[PDB]
Amino acid sequence: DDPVRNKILHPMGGVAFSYRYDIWYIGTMDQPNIFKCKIKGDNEYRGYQW
Amino acid sequence: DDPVRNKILHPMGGVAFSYRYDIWYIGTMDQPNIFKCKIKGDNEYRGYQWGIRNPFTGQKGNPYMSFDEDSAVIHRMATLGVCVLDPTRTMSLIPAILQG
Amino acid sequence: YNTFSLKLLEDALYELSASKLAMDDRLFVIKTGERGAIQFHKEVLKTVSG
Amino acid sequence: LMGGNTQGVPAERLQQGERFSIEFAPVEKELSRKVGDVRFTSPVSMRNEW
Amino acid sequence: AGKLGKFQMLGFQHWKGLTSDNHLGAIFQQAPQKATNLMVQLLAFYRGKS
Amino acid sequence: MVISINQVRQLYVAKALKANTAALTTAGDIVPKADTAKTTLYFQSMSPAGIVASDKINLKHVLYAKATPSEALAHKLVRYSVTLDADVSATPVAGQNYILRLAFRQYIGLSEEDQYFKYGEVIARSGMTASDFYKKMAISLAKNLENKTESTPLVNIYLISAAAASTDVPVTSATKESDLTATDYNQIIIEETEQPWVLGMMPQAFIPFTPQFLTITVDGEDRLWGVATVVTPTKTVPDGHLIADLEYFCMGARGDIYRGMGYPNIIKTTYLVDPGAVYDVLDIHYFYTGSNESVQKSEKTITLVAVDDGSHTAMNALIGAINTASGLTIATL
Amino acid sequence: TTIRIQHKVAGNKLNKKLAMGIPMVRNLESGKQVKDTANMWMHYVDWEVE
Amino acid sequence: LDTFLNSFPTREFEDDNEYYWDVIGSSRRNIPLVEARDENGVVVAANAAN
Ligand SMILES: [Mg+2]
């Protein structure tokens, strides 16, 4: 329902993204069908150029 | 529905102030949104502008006579305040007869 | 309002509750007069009649 | 145009009434230079009498 | 009677008789107070952190 | 309005164009100056207090220089045109109430999340011609919008008759059907209004809205009755209230930045922008780079504002001067 | 995928203090503004970066 | 009426001086568009190609 990111508005009120019907995890997979990928040690690099 | 102050009448029965809907708290604000304001140490004052007799206090002789006439007066004053932080947390739909 | 309608009311209260209130926070208590309670009854009746 | 688009963008979607938002700054893994920045706001006040 | 500084805005003011709040406000002795407990967070259902 | 600075901006008002540094008499008077070598450019401005001169522009470190006609700076006011859906019913059906919802997205705050809803409704009747419907609905919309219980002017209501088709008939909370006598109304127009502006405290901002409709049962099904068609705007807010605040800001780069935080102990700053006047804008970007190891650039902006008659006369002469004086080629707008 | 951010600041902002003529406010992930007691400008840029 | 009012709380002040409270609002924004130009600075009308 976020109105900031969703800009198109429906004739019937609200954002057109609220009228979106999504079925996540159809059936049952032994492992996750969707996951977030990270890397082992640290891929976060900070530096100052002053 | 007090018929004393509310003097305008609705044709479909009664006082047009009863046909009035008010949501005074749209949510919980965690802080009072409507409160009666008062001042500290400077509230109601009272005094008497009298001559020789004071029925109020019951005094018979006056050393400091305000005036000669045999009369007593009593004066009072008060300071008031009332705050509504955000009227956006208040919904009210009113009959038009009560408008202008 | 000249003619009180519950249609307009439910629209306004919902739209408001959507943008400002959680589903667990959309209870609205109305303070009114006995004649307004009757106007309310009349309209809720005209409503379910539909 | 990112995202692999090849046909372009219709003229509509590029008109007076159109609203945008910030997603991210994607960069190379080879010889990456700088991108991005941050943003701020400020509040207001209200008054009453006696 | 005159200006000493280069950016001096105030001059010496003087009055004789019955003193009013207007007097004290015109010589910068009246100020609205700040109610610090009092505060207003604009009510909205924030579809962020979602 | 606080804005983005690449690293700095500066604003000088071109209230009058003078050929010499000697003809600078009145404030606003400005002259562009550059050597015959066309190696450095600067503007001498007649300040109210005295006479100042802009930073010096190396004509080989200029990045972009462009004018603006003040028409790209007038925020256009988007106006909808509400009508009865001829596919549902070209005329009002008697026993149905036609409610209209006006959704406002930035009401008091800055976000789209801060939204606000006014309404307008009419219960139709038998033999209610469409013109009568637009009438009664216009009054209902205006009365609930322009009442004495609104902290801001949200919307403006207009009507249009088939005869004129271009003249917009005003409808406020002070209008009655006794005044709306025509019988050929075709639509309800709904604009957005310009909010209150204070020089450096409340910036130019608007409340954008969308007319949303509610359903009516025509035969046996719920159906929307209206068509919120967007048409070409015809009313704009000029540049005045926008340039003045830009000027108010860009005069802290070379002046007092407090601007009031000690009220009687303030340095009063005089401004040369008249809100209500329309200003074209010339904007030059450029940088300064060191000698041997200080090759890091220092990009700099210099803004110029000249009032705009219909003909862009003040800024077309100013440009002609700068072009002949610096060899640049800035496009006469 | 790779992501980068940058932000420039002037040295004068070091140990800099703010004259709280209006409350200094942070922007939260939700989207709500929150009043802050801090007077350092670095406090706020640090927040907006992350 | 006494009951109506006595349903509300009351807060003390120190004087009859105008008071003011702060009003913090929302942060998340969304920028509109003015126009769009092709690679040659010509503006794209709605009856135009990609
Ligand atoms: Mg209210």
Q: Copy the structure tokens of residue F209.
A: 């809205």
Which residues in chain A have Cβ-Cβ distances shorter than 8 Å to C18?
A: 1, 14
Is some CB atom of chain B closer than 8 A to the CB atom of C28? yes
Tokens of B6: 């509310």
CA distances from H31 to A5, D17, F72 (A): 11, 10, 16
CA distance B30 to H25: 16
Task: For residues H30 and H33, give the distance between their C-alpha atoms in angstroms, rounded to a whole number.
Answer: 10
Strands F40-46 and F57-58: antiparallel
Q: How far apart are CA F4 and CA F285, in angstroms?
A: 14
Instruction: Return the beta strands (E) in F204-296 as ranges.
Output: 209-213, 215-217, 222-224, 229-231, 236-237, 279-287
**Are H24 and G25 a contacting pair at CB < 8 A?**
yes
Q: What is the crossing angle of helices C6-20 and C34-48, to 10°?
A: 90
- Residue F144 C-alpha to ligand 1 middle, in angstroms? 14
Chain G touching partners, 3 or more CB pairs below 8 A: D, E, F, H
Q: What is the DSSP string of G1-50?
A: --B-------GGGTT-B---SS-EEEEPSSSBEEEE---BHHHHHHHHH-
Please list the alpha-helical segments (H only) found in chain F: 130-145, 240-250, 313-326
Residue in A7, C1, C25 with CA at minimum distance from that of residue C13: C25
C and G in touch (3+ CB pairs within 8 angstroms): no
Query: Which residues does residue E25 pair with via DSSP β-bridges, in sequence order?
Result: none
CB under 8 Å to E10, separation ≥6 — which residues?
F264, F265
Per DSSP bridges, beta strands B91-93 and B21-23 are antiparallel
Residues G34 and D42: their CA atoms lie apart, in Å, by 10
- Structure-determination approach: cryo-EM
Q: Cα separation of F37 and F39, whole Å?
A: 5
Please count the CA atoms within 13 angstroms of the CA of A33 that sit on its side-chain side: 7
Nearest CA-CA distance, residue E39 and chain A, Å: 26
* CA-based nearest distance A49→chain F, Å: 12
Chains D and H touch (3+ CB pairs under 8 A): yes
- Specify the residue for token string 């036609």: F98
Q: Which residue of A has its CA nearest to E50?
A: A2
Burial readout B15-36 (b: 16 or more C-beta within 10 A, e: otherwise): bbbbbbbebbebbebeeebbbe
Q: Is C37 exposed, middle or buried (0-12, 13-18, 19+ CB in 10 A)?
A: middle
Q: G29 contacts in H (CB within 8 Å)?
A: none
Instruction: Pull the structure tokens for residue D18.
Output: 């159109």
- The number of angstroms, rounded, from the C-alpha of F229 to the middle of its chain's C-alpha atoms is 22
C-beta atoms of G31 and F111 within 8 A: yes
- Pull the structure tokens for residue F262: 């000690």
CB contact under 8 A, B88 and E43: yes
Chain D nearest C-alpha distance from A44 (Å)? 13
Give me the long-range contacts of C36-39 (CB less than 8 A, separation at least 24).
C36/B18, C36/B19, C36/B20, C36/B21, C38/B13, C39/B12, C39/B19, C39/C4
DSSP for residue B88: G
For residues D7 and F81, give the distance between their C-alpha atoms in angstroms, rounded to a whole number. Answer: 33
Set of chain D residues whose Cβ sits within 8 Å of the Cβ of A5: 21
Three-state secondary structure of E4-40: CCCCCCCCCCCCCCCCCHHHHHHCCCCCCEEEEEEEE
Resolution for this model in angstroms, one decimal place? 3.0
Chain C residues in contact with B25 by the CB 8 A cut-off are 29
Q: How many CB atoms lie within 10 A of CB E15?
A: 10
- For F40, the 3-state DSSP assignment is strand
- End-to-end Cα separation, chain D, in angstroms: 60
Distance in Å, alpha carbon of F331 to nearest chain D alpha carbon: 25
Q: Is the Cβ–Cβ distance between C2 and F97 less than 8 Å?
A: no
> Which of these, F33, F68, F62, lies nearest to F285 by C-alpha position?
F62
CA dihedral F139→F141→F144→F148, nearest 10 degrees, is -70
What does the buried/exposed string (b/e) look like for B55-80 if buried means 16 or more CB atoms within 10 Å of the residue's CB? eeeeeeeeeeeeeeeeebeeeeeeee
Taking the C-alpha atoms of residue E8 and residue B84, their distance in angstroms, rounded to an integer, is 41
Q: Which residues of A touch D21 (CB under 8 A)?
A: 4-5, 7
Tokens found for residue F210: 């969308």
- Chain B residues lying within 8 Å of E43, measured CB to CB: 26-27, 86, 88-89
Task: Report d(CA F287, CA H49) in Å as an integer.
Answer: 38
Q: Under a CB-based contact definition with an 8 Å cutoff, are residues F108 and H25 in contact?
A: yes
A41–chain H nearest CA distance, Å: 33
Using the mean position of ligand 1's atoms as its centre, give its distance from the Cα of residue A49 in Å.
52
The radius of gyration of chain A's CA atoms, rounded to the nearest angstrom, is 20
| CA diameter of chain H | 73
φ/ψ of B35, rounded to 5, equals -150, 155
Q: How far is CA F158 from the centre of its chain?
A: 21
Helix or strand run (H / E) with residue F34? strand F29-34
Q: How far apart are CA F175 and CA F182, in angstroms?
A: 14
Dist. CA B80–CA B82, nearest whole Å: 7
